[PDB]
Amino acid sequence: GIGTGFPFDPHYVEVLGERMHYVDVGPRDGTPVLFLHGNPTSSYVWRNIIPHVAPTHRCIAPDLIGMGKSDKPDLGYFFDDHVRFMDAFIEALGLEEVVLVIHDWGSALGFHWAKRNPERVKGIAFMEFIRPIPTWDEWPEFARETFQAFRTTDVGRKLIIDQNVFIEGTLPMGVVRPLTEVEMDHYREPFLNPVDREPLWRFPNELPIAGEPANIVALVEEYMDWLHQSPVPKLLFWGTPGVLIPPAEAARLAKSLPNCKAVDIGPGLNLLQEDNPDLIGSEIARWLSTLEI
Numbered sequence: 001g002i003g004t005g006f007p008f009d010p011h012y013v014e015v016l017g018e019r020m021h022y023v024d025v026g027p028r029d030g031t032p033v034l035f036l037h038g039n040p041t042s043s044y045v046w047r048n049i050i051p052h053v054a055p056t057h058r059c060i061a062p063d064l065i066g067m068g069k070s071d072k073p074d075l076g077y078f079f080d081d082h083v084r085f086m087d088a089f090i091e092a093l094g095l096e097e098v099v100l101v102i103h104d105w106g107s108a109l110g111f112h113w114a115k116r117n118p119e120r121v122k123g124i125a126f127m128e129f130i131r132p133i134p135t136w137d138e139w140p141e142f143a144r145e146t147f148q149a150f151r152t153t154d155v156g157r158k159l160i161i162d163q164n165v166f167i168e169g170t171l172p173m174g175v176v177r178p179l180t181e182v183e184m185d186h187y188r189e190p191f192l193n194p195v196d197r198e199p200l201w202r203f204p205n206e207l208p209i210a211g212e213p214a215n216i217v218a219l220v221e222e223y224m225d226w227l228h229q230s231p232v233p234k235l236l237f238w239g240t241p242g243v244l245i246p247p248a249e250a251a252r253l254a255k256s257l258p259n260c261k262a263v264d265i266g267p268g269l270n271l272l273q274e275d276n277p278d279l280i281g282s283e284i285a286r287w288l289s290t291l292e293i
């Protein structure tokens with residue numbers, strides 16, 4: 001059985017006047033491994049992968065601001081808000097050099113931070129990450145109209161804020177195998193009140209699709225350009241058919257990104273962690289030995 005529980009002790013750090021929650025396990029010395037979750041998850045999405053890395057490496061898994069057990073300030077939760085909070089989280093924890101394990105919107109946070117701090121990143125494991133979607137044709141047909149509806153302030157907010165569709169429908173449709181009730185309740189816990197769902201709606205409205213928003217498209221194209229040239233060790237997980245990263249894209253990236261290892265995880269949509277956590281965790285563990293950390 002795939003683990004459903006969250007046994008990690010809570011850790012907190014005051015950041016920009018707001019308390020943020022993070023998982024911190026593993027030995028204290030050596031290079032830490034920073035796990036960055038996306039939408040609409042939390043450090044809970046790393047629950048079955050950390051146990052493969054925690055025996056030999058420090059594992060830090062924060063909850064993004066307004067998500068998980070972190071505080072819920074009255075912000076718009078634009079990507080720029082998450083950048084400032086994640087920049088200040090990393091400094092508040094005194095992290096010097098790190099290995100990144102990033103997913104979904106956390107990957108945009110990881111890549112944007114690694115582009116600005118390339119000396120402090122010894123490797124990047126990433127899966128179902130954010131890239132420029134040139135046209136709506138590059139978005140999966142089965143989820144296309146709903147995400148077009150998500151990116152509006154009337155129908156989009158009604159679905160996500162008022163009806164919580166992103167948790168009750170979009171999240172299960174990002175996973176191939178079925179999610180138990182206990183797993184669903186963990187993902188529901190930070191969003192029982194419609195107020196807390198603002199990041200669940202701003203995130204898909206920040207997706208770089210068809211040139212909008214222009215600022216996010218430029219930002220993501222920048223770190224994609226850095227990724228195509230930098231020699232930082234890269235580990236990419238992908239599944240079939242995926243959502244953000246289709247198999248043909250993963251094959252292209254596996255040849256064009258320097259020092260990159262691609263790992264097929266089998267069937268998979270967006271939350272690859274939930275469809276094959278053992279392969280992801282045990283491959284990250286094996287890959288960390290090939291780094292000079």
Ligand SMILES: CN(C)c1ccc2c(-c3cc(C(=O)NCCOCCOCCCCNS(C)(=O)=O)ccc3C(=O)O)c3ccc(=[N+](C)C)cc-3oc2c1
Binds near residue numbers: 040104142168173270
């Ligand atoms: C439990 N079961 C499997 C479902 C499945 C679907 C639904 C749906 C549902 C969702 C969708 C839907 O979410 N489509 C789109 C998902 O496909 C995206 C998958 O990749 C994205 C992963 C996340 C990526 N994160 S990022 C980068 O974006 O930040 C479409 C139609 C329906 C429908 O019903 O007619 C419900 C709709 C309304 C509703 N009421 C008003 C309370 C309840 C719904 O309940 C559902 C339950």
